[PDB]
Amino acid sequence: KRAPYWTNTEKMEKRLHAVPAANTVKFRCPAGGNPMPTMRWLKNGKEFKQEHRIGGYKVRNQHWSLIMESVVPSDKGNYTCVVENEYGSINHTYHLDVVERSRHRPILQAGLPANASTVVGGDVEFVCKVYSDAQPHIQWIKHVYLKVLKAAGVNTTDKEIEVLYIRNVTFEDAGEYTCLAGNSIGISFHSAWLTVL
Amino acid sequence: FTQHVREQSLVTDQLSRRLIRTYQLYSRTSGKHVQVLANKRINAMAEDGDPFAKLIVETDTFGSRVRVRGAETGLYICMNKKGKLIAKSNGKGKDCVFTEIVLENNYTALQNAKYEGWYMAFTRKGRPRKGSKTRQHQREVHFMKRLPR
């Protein structure tokens, strides 16, 4: 009587599902047709088996849905629903991106910036590595009463790396230096001492 | 350093290097990415990797206060008094600053700094939503930061 056809292209228009880790992901492909069409799911083009992920998955035929609970990064990929009956077969592919999130204040690498010593006129540097999901701001501070110093740095996929260079050190440069990081949750800071001889 | 940060958090830090992150803003409702077009239009209908969806997010100061700029157009995403998202060449005003929030449901939200009750938001079809109608629990105000492709 009738080939399979999507009954709600609305939800299907949202091909990319980008979600935080620990979320439940539900893919739907509401289908019509007579007789009622059957449905199968593929992951990355091949048969999606229960053993393909920890905790497997669930399918609710009445809702034409694939359900994956507590998704993790290894769940990233393509998921294709194949619906069919005697009059035809159709498919739709969803893409899943899973991102691990953190609702914590910044975390700095222990030991950085490290203490340093140098003879007058010598050069020194201080390094700080900051991990923060929420975009952080970083300040290098000289305990002089605080003086904010301008440093250099680079952004990387999993952390901010900053370095403060102090050239032609003088006795006045001696003292404590702090790397202060903060995001929308809170702050964290590590301090180091510059010894001039 | 609490008092120091409370103080510094009020305005732009003009004495420090300001960190920059580059990514795409995925809209939970639209399934697409935030983009700033040459005609200065802003929406969330861009496919993954669309040049106009590459955003440059520079921190303003502490508290995850940032400015969101379209790398391609060089235009900043700002909000006007009517809660309308507008693209501007000059992004100096507080109206161009947003506080990045990691919601309790683990999604990202961007709250405007000038109008503290308004959030960047888009509809299911990827159209801009007036900040005045935005509340933190609505899916329209939820995003996911995605790596550039």
From Swiss-Prot, chain A:
Outcome after substituting residue 139 to P: In CS and JWS
Disulphide-bonded residues: 29-81, 128-179
Region (Heparin-binding): 11-28
Effect of residue 22 to F: In PS; requires 2 nucleotide substitutions
Subcellular location: Cell membrane; Golgi apparatus; Cytoplasmic vesicle
Top-rank lineage group of the source organism: Eukaryota
Result of altering residue 179 to S: In CS, JWS, PS and ABS2
Residues bearing glycans: 78, 91, 115, 155, 168
Consequence the record notes for mutating residue 128 to F: In CS, JWS and PS; forms disulfide-linked dimers with constitutive kinase activity, is retained in an intracellular compartment and not detected at the cell surface
Effect of residue 122 to V: In an ovarian serous carcinoma sample; somatic mutation
Listed result of changing residue 115 to Q: Reduced N-glycosylation. Reduced expression at the cell surface
Domain Ig-like C2-type: 4-97, 106-195
Result of changing residue 102 to F: In APRS; requires 2 nucleotide substitutions
PTM statement from Swiss-Prot or TrEMBL: Autophosphorylated. Binding of FGF family members together with heparan sulfate proteoglycan or heparin promotes receptor dimerization and autophosphorylation on several tyrosine residues. Autophosphorylation occurs in trans between the two FGFR molecules present in the dimer.
Connected disease: Crouzon syndrome: An autosomal dominant syndrome characterized by craniosynostosis, hypertelorism, exophthalmos and external strabismus, parrot-beaked nose, short upper lip, hypoplastic maxilla, and a relative mandibular prognathism. Jackson-Weiss syndrome: An autosomal dominant craniosynostosis syndrome characterized by craniofacial abnormalities and abnormality of the feet: broad great toes with medial deviation and tarsal-metatarsal coalescence.
Job of this protein: Tyrosine-protein kinase that acts as a cell-surface receptor for fibroblast growth factors and plays an essential role in the regulation of cell proliferation, differentiation, migration and apoptosis, and in the regulation of embryonic development. Required for normal embryonic patterning, trophoblast function, limb bud development, lung morphogenesis, osteogenesis and skin development. Plays an essential role in the regulation of osteoblast differentiation, proliferation and apoptosis, and is required for normal skeleton development.
Family: Belongs to the protein kinase superfamily. Tyr protein kinase family. Fibroblast growth factor receptor subfamily.
Description of its domains: The second and third Ig-like domains directly interact with fibroblast growth factors (FGF) and heparan sulfate proteoglycans. Alternative splicing events affecting the third Ig-like domain are crucial for ligand selectivity.
The protein's name: Fibroblast growth factor receptor 2
Protein species of origin: Homo sapiens
Taxonomic lineage of the native organism: Eukaryota, Metazoa, Chordata, Craniata, Vertebrata
Gene: FGFR2
Residues of the full protein shown: 151 to 360 of 821
Curated annotation (Swiss-Prot), chain B:
S-S bonds: none
Primary subcellular site in the record, as a coarse category: secreted
Location of this chain's protein in the cell: Secreted
GO biological process, one term: neurogenesis
Keywords: Developmental protein, Differentiation, Disease variant, Glycoprotein, Growth factor, Hypogonadotropic hypogonadism, Kallmann syndrome, Mitogen, Secreted, Signal
Reported impact of residue 67 to G: In HH6; phenotype consistent with Kallmann syndrome
Transmembrane segments: none
Disease implicated: Hypogonadotropic hypogonadism 6 with or without anosmia: A disorder characterized by absent or incomplete sexual maturation by the age of 18 years, in conjunction with low levels of circulating gonadotropins and testosterone and no other abnormalities of the hypothalamic-pituitary axis. In some cases, it is associated with non-reproductive phenotypes, such as anosmia, cleft palate, and sensorineural hearing loss. Anosmia or hyposmia is related to the absence or hypoplasia of the olfactory bulbs and tracts. Hypoplastic femurs and pelvis: An autosomal dominant disorder characterized by isolated bilateral hypoplasia of the femoral and pelvic bones.
Role this protein plays: Plays an important role in the regulation of embryonic development, cell proliferation, cell differentiation and cell migration. Required for normal brain, eye, ear and limb development during embryogenesis. Required for normal development of the gonadotropin-releasing hormone (GnRH) neuronal system. Plays a role in neurite outgrowth in hippocampal cells.
Subunit structure: Monomer. Homodimer. Interacts with FGFR1, FGFR2, FGFR3 and FGFR4. Affinity between fibroblast growth factors (FGFs) and their receptors is increased by heparan sulfate glycosaminoglycans that function as coreceptors.
Recorded family membership: Belongs to the heparin-binding growth factors family.
Listed name of the protein: Fibroblast growth factor 8
Organism: Homo sapiens (Human)
Lineage start: Eukaryota, Metazoa, Chordata, Craniata, Vertebrata
